[PDB]
Amino acid sequence: GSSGSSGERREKKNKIMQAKEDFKKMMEEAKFNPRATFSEFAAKHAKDSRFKAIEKMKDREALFNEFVAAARKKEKESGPSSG
């Protein structure tokens, strides 16, 4: 089945952006395999201070789910944002 979040509550600070960046970027560099599970990935890159920034389980599962969702295949039925 599908999962994820819809409409989060950001604060009046540049904390989220910063983190999200280090996270999304940190993973992009790792170029890990989609076969692995979120749990493993988390622990694998848990020591990474930046990674620690993302505690909100939902946030991790979400950011990860999307990352792997695209990593495996790009030409798939997906279109959350137009841009």
From Swiss-Prot:
Protein name: Transcription elongation regulator 1
Subunit (UniProt): Binds formin. Interacts (via the second WW domain) with TREX1 (via proline-rich region). Binds RNA polymerase II, HD and SF1.
Residue window of the full protein shown: 717 to 786 of 1098
Free-text comment about domains: The FF domains bind the phosphorylated C-terminus of the largest subunit of RNA polymerase II, probably mediate interaction with HTATSF1 and preferentially bind peptides with the consensus sequence [DE](2-5)-[FWY]-[DE](2-5).
Domain of life: Eukaryota
Induction notes from the record: Up-regulated in brain tissue from patients with Huntington disease.
Domain FF, chain residue ranges per copy: 16-70
Tissue: Detected in brain neurons.
Disulfide bonds: none
Organism of origin: Homo sapiens
Gene that this sequence comes from: TCERG1
Function, in words: Transcription factor that binds RNA polymerase II and inhibits the elongation of transcripts from target promoters. Regulates transcription elongation in a TATA box-dependent manner. Necessary for TAT-dependent activation of the human immunodeficiency virus type 1 (HIV-1) promoter.
Localization terms from the record: Nucleus
